[PDB]
Amino acid sequence: VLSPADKTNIKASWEKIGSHGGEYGAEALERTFLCFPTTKTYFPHFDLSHGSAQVKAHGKKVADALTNAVGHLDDLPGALSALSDLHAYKLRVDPVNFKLLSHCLLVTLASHHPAEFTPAVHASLDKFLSSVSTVLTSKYR
Amino acid sequence: VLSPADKTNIKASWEKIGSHGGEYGAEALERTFLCFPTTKTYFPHFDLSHGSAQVKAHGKKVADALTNAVGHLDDLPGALSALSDLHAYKLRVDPVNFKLLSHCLLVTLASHHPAEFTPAVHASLDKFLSSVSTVLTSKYR
Amino acid sequence: VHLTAEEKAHVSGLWGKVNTEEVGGEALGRLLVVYPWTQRFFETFGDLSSANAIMNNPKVKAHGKKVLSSFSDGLKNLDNLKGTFAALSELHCDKLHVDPENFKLLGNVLVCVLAHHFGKEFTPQVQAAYQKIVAGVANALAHKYH
Amino acid sequence: VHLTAEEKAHVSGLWGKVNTEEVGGEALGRLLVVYPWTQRFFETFGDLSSANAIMNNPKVKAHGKKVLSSFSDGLKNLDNLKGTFAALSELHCDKLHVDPENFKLLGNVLVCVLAHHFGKEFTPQVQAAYQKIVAGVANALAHKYH
């Protein structure tokens, strides 16, 4: 459950990320397949080479999706309906995998903005990725 | 995230529990200390013998608390403020312990109402104890 | 796991009373309902989209039966869980990609099913012993992983 | 854990560059902020109610320093993690009651701190190796538990 200080911290931290959104999502995925390879099996279609325009584009979907998420911190269930529909009904993604990716996003954000990645911000954003994950793994259609 | 079918199922299942509320909470705790003894350390004050009027009374607080919870499935954060305040700020309860107790509640409910403990009901009520736990472990004061 | 004689007896006394025809498929069924992402591993078992489908799917039963006598295997080789589970641990953790967190989840569903079947008779003390068992299996099934 | 030569080198190259004075207390600090229930184990360390208190508490630092050179111990005994961590595993899992899920959590905080310190240089490949390390420690610290 995010507090208003959690909201302030995610809102402040997220636009500081900004245009570099798409580029950090891609790094957050590359980092995921690399440290945790079993999660490669969710994208057997995908070109998962280190170049990949694909991993990049998809890396842009994630980033966008989380922006959507920070715009409606008050109604994540409602904003995240369709993505929940996808990750829970259609892809049946195992909840451990959101925690890997979620952690991989943090390593990434911390390696790029060390000034904004304060101990408190770290706390709020982990709660956030922990809350978006629960939506994306629950079925409530 | 509970669906309306989750709500119907918890609401239906919970009043079927009813007066036997207090008595199942106590069993759910006894079962917790027994299968998982490290969780005894949260109640070093307590008489934790098998008789215990205390474990019984406290067993009545839990049960009540969850009733409160089923009355406001729509606003758990708001109804569970004070209990969150207690379990998160004051007792700093480790989240593994809600999962032990939560599981112990299920074993208990299943051993008493096998007719209502259908596969679906089992599903809705685990989501529920998983959602009340998150409130009680988050800090948002 | 190493549970004592006392514990190995709470366990075997009621395991003797189990219907090995319905208990496994119902724990495997419940696992598929309560934790719906476990569904991904069983795409081949036919239709898993509803509570009653899962519960009545024939394939779920059959394989449940195979899960549960594999638990009966654990109970007969109760102090080399690693060895008796070395073939299944490489299978699950290598060929199938099952996150071992799901091992712990299945033993809890089974425990609830055990409680569901036996009721009052599935005493806390009885559970406690059965937690050692499921934890043990869970952990042996993860050995060639961790 | 057994990581290869290649991996043992990604790891040691940058571990040589670490400030062992600030890195541990900051991972222990972060652990206390990000996962506030870990606070219960350290009631004696004085005031943990705020982000900056934790971060500036002197006792947090001191013990952080002790956590992190205990990681430097893991790195020198990198293929008997069990043995080198048999004293700490009985300590934590017996005298202190630390749920081993918290082991995994601390190694992730440290990883983020590593990423925070080194930035671009903390490459995915570098991380990947450091995940094997933290996972290994986490798992050795739980051996006389599981």
Ligand code: HEM
């Ligand atoms: C923060 C959590 C996540 C978010 C916000 C997210 C977001 C998205 C978005 C926006 C799409 C596609 C949008 C579209 O084109 O309609 C997608 C699809 C997908 N996601 Fe995720 N995702 C998350 C976590 C995960 C995890 C943990 C996995 C498992 C490894 C995963 C695997 C997939 C796969 C396989 C697709 C299908 C895309 C394709 O077939 O090209 N996602 N997700």
Ligand code: HEM
């Ligand atoms: C469903 C989740 C839980 C609920 C609804 C719940 C509910 C409650 C209630 C209603 C009270 C006291 C009410 C009052 O007198 O103001 C309480 C206190 C307490 N709870 Fe929980 N609890 C839960 C989980 C846990 C867990 C996992 C633990 C850890 C073992 C725990 C340990 C305690 C302790 C030590 C107290 C203090 C009571 C005393 O000092 O006598 N609770 N909880």
Ligand code: HEM
């Ligand atoms: C409680 C611990 C578990 C035990 C003791 C167990 C036991 C078994 C056994 C005995 C087999 C048969 C292999 C053969 O006949 O050669 C098997 C296969 C399999 N296991 Fe498990 N299982 C467990 C948990 C799980 C879980 C939680 C999952 C998924 C999340 C899973 C996924 C599978 C799959 C997909 C197969 C083969 C499917 C097929 O070909 O029809 N297992 N397991």
Ligand code: HEM
């Ligand atoms: C990353 C894995 C960890 C390692 C390698 C580690 C290392 C250590 C070390 C080296 C000591 C010192 C014992 C001595 O000086 O004799 C210690 C003690 C201690 N550990 Fe850990 N630790 C870890 C994780 C944790 C976590 C996550 C917690 C709590 C959640 C914890 C709780 C404690 C406490 C409370 C003490 C003693 C407190 C005192 O007397 O001041 N440890 N640990």
